[PDB]
C-alpha cells in the first residue's frame with residue numbers, strides 16, 4: 279500500500295535506490311524511425327525518442343514522424359499523448375497531430391524560456407488579433423480567450439483545418455511554475471491544476487487523447503500522467519490500496535522512455551496521489567482546500 283511504502287522509503291531515505299530500480303527494470307524498445315537521419319531536426323533531445331511501436335504517426339505521405347508517444351493505459355481505460363515541446367519547425371506537425379488525433383486538450387507543464395534557454399517554441403498565439411497559420415500543415419490557430427491565474431493559465435483556442443474549413447475548440451492548460459527537473463510547489467497546487475484539466479472534460483474517452491508536454495515530454499509530463507492514471511485506477515475501484523504506483527509507472531514506460539526523471543518527482547507522485555485519494559474516496563472539502571493552498575488568485 280502506497281502510504282505505508284512511502285513512509286518506509288522516507289524512513290530509510292531510499293528514493294534514489296527505488297527510483298534507480300525503476301530505470302533498471304524499464305522496457306527497452308527500438309526507436310529506429312526517430313533515429314533516421316532525416317528526422318534529426320525533428321527531435322529536441324538526442325537522447326529522448328519515442329518507441330516505434332507506440333509513436334504517433336502524422337497522416338502525411340512525406341514524413342509521418344513527430345516525437346510523440348501514445349501512452350495507452352488499458353486497465354485504467356485512458357490514453358495520453360506525451361510529446362516534446364514543439365520546435366520552430368514542428369509546430370505545424372504538433373497541431374496536425376492534435377487535429378488528426380481529435381484531442382480536446384493540451385497540457386503544457388513548462389515555460390517557453392527556462393534558465394535562459396528556449397525549451398519550447400511559441401506554438402500558440404499570445405494575442406487574439408494575431409492568429410497563427412501553419413502553411414505546411416494548412417491549419418489556422420486563434421486565441422479566443424484566456425484565464426490567467428497565479429501559477430497557471432487556461433486558454434481557449436480555435437483550431438481550423440483550412441482544407442475543410444472545419445473548426446474545433448482546443449483547451450490549453452499551462453502550468454507556469456513547475457521547474458525543469460523539479461516538482462510542483464505542493465501537492466495542492468498540482469492537484470488543483472489536474473482537477474482543472476479534468477473538469478474541462480478534456481480527458482473524456484469521447485475525445486481523442488489529451489496531449490501532454492513539457493520540454494522533453496517525459497519528466498514533468500510523466501509525473502503528471504502517472505498521478506492522473508493512479509487516481510483514475512483508484513477511482514474505478516474505489517480502493518486506494520489496490521494501486522501499485524511503481525507498477526503503473528513501469529506499464530506507462532512501455533509506451534515512452536524515461537517517464538519521471540528524478541527520484542523526487544517520483545516521491546512527489548506518491549504525495550499527489552495519496553492526497554488526491556481523499557477526494558476520490560468522498561472528501562468534498564479537499565478540493566476547495568487545494569484551491570486555497572494553491573493561491574491561484
Ligand SMILES: O=C(O)COc1c(-c2nn[nH]n2)sc(-c2cccc(NC3CCN(S(=O)(=O)Cc4ccccc4)CC3)c2)c1Br
Nearest residue numbers: 304305306323325397458459492493494497498535536539
Ligand atoms: O521535465 C523535466 O523534469 C526535465 O525535462 C528534461 C530536460 C529539460 N531541459 N530543460 N528543460 N527541460 S532535458 C531532459 C533529458 C534529456 C536527455 C536525456 C535525459 N536523461 C535520460 C535518463 C535515462 N533515460 S531512460 O529512459 O531511463 C533509458 C532507458 C530506456 C529504456 C529502458 C531502460 C532505460 C532517458 C532520459 C534527460 C529532460 Br527529462
